[PDB]
Design a protein around this ligand. Sequence first.
Ligand SMILES: Cc1nnn(C)c1-c1cnc2c3ccc(C(C)(C)O)c(F)c3n([C@H](c3ncccc3F)C3CCOCC3)c2c1
Ligand SMILES: Cc1nnn(C)c1-c1cnc2c3ccc(C(C)(C)O)c(F)c3n([C@H](c3ncccc3F)C3CCOCC3)c2c1
Length: 108
Amino acid sequence: RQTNQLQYLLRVVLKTLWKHQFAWPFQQPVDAVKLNLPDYYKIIKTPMDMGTIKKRLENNYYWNAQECIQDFNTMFTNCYIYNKPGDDIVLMAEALEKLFLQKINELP
Ligand SMILES: Cc1nnn(C)c1-c1cnc2c3ccc(C(C)(C)O)c(F)c3n([C@H](c3ncccc3F)C3CCOCC3)c2c1
Ligand SMILES: Cc1nnn(C)c1-c1cnc2c3ccc(C(C)(C)O)c(F)c3n([C@H](c3ncccc3F)C3CCOCC3)c2c1
């Protein structure tokens, strides 16, 4: 719901997630080629990462907060859909999502 919440998502939510030790694989799109993952983009049709979210927040792409929250949803959900439970990347996405939930509770 406009600018204040979107700035809170940039300055508080994204910043806290970005600075976490577990952030680095989510800071840029999944490079399925470098990672030797032939079926990533056969399974994942809507890729999403925090680098893209950061750019969208910085260039006023979003109409409202919820559209940004959907991008965070897509990023966490893609990871859960593609990978097995117990995979390290899933545990990292789960810990980032826990931190995301702690921050979006104080959403103005
Ligand atoms: C998947 C997958 N599903 N959702 N996401 C977000 C990812 C994903 C995205 N980016 C990366 C990534 C980027 C660079 C490098 C190196 C090479 C260090 O520059 C990696 F290693 C990377 N790996 C590893 C990785 N995952 C799967 C297969 C091979 C592989 F290396 C993770 C192995 C477990 O600990 C964390 C990193 C990623 C996994
Ligand atoms: C409640 C509640 N009462 N009725 N309904 C239907 C919901 C409801 C149901 N599903 C979701 C949901 C699913 C995944 C993810 C992530 C984590 C992105 O995958 C969410 F964020 C989600 N949130 C957020 C949310 N709501 C409340 C507390 C935490 C929280 F994150 C909304 C915050 C405002 O913008 C829209 C999403 C939901 C709220």
